[PDB]
């Protein structure tokens, strides 16, 4: 079952008839984390290279 | 894709719903308003001649 | 007299300290809409040895696993509700700031008055007579004392003092011979400092006031109490019925009053060994729970928190070292009635402390106040047609005890 | 001023309405529908069962 609105604000509604839709939400979030990088030092075309 | 094109005069989405309007829909009142002032105007004057 | 100034005069405060010192960690979110309204933690496991001087030994008299379990609970409200007549409340305040700032001290007031008469109440430990005040050093340091010889590790251990008992240890402060530093301390701002004897002392204006209750005659213990593991295994609290008491009272033992069994003496939990305190051994004490009468032939029924464990097929779990049985004499601590505000001390694995989120109302204007790590729900309605407008404040405890060997009451000693 | 919603169910359409009493700190929902019934004809129905 699927029917859950999440927080369905219940806002003030002024209106008259209505539509059947549910309503879902994404969630965007930001983090630092500790990731190991690899330098490649191939001398051909270039050299440095992280 | 679908083979149908969509024409709209002014079209916005305000709750939900697809809410679409022209050029005639903001002035029907003071139309039929006008319209029944001069019918009332009419009948009356027509009433009594002198 | 009719210009009134727009500035309100400042008002009067408690501290709080017990709120900050407990833990609020263990018991954090935990009870939900799913776990219900208690929840349980487990508890340590304990094991005996055998002594015998052969191997092939496959099969003999092994030992038991029993386990055992702390429950929480929740508490009542905490409300405040206000009600005025809208025209004269807003003639002269406007939009109600100025009621704000008395009803969240009020509250969290509340929360802590209740907190601390909940560990006076569930509180085993005691030292020292109720009479004497504290005044010298070692009044301090007992508690400390006490506590690391139990064997109690895990954790910080606090103390906590009425202001004036503080001023006096800080004029003895004064005295001192050598530490320049601690004598312009003291002599400048009358502060101790952060640790005081081993443990860590603390001053509190705000603390729980109790009477002892009225009791006379030679008590003793008329029937042989159950006190065995699998009994007590989940409150650590026994009831036990007194006789020779005073023929008819109402109110006989009050709530948080110390009986003391004189025979039987604590032992340090690990090593399974008697305490000595010096020149004596230290007996064993109990609080009592609930307000106790005397019936005719003085039969006084009495739940204690704090039990004596001397169970004979789990030897693992005691923690006394004889059993008690009929005919045994016991005291109560204290005078007869008189009335005294007690100092505290406890580890931090005492007891616990949690709120409980609360859903907002349907249809009512509401909004969330967070003060000192507390959050109070306040409501707003108009119900009525006195033109009489509503506000509510709201906030819910839940409480719990872990283990009562580890904190109790303290008084001086002469 | 009552916090309400519209749920769907066959082609019906049902009013919900949630609010609470204050004072006893009670919640409370209702769902609302109003049916209208009218019979046209009389001579164009009936009941059929099994002749002998």
Redesign the interface.
Known sequence: PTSLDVT?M?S??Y?WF????IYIAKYYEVRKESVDVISYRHPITGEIAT | HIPLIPVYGKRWFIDDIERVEGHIAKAMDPQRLYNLQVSMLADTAAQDPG | SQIVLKKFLPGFMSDLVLAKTVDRQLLAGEINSSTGDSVSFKRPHQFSSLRTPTGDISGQNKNNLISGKATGRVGNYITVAVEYQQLEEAIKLNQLEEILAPVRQRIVTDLETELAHFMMNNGALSLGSPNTPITKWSDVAQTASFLKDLGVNEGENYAVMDPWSAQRLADAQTGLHASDQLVRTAWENAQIPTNFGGIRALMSNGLASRTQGAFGGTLTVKTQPTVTYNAVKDSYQFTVTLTGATASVTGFLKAGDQVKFTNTYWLQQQTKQALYNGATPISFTATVTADANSDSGGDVTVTLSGVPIYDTTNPQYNSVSRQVEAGDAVSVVGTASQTMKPNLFYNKFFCGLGSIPLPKLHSIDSAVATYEGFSIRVHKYADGDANVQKMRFDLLPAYVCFNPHMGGQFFGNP
Not at chain 1, 18 to 21: L, R, T, W
């Open positions: 369905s219940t003030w509604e209106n209505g539509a059947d839709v």
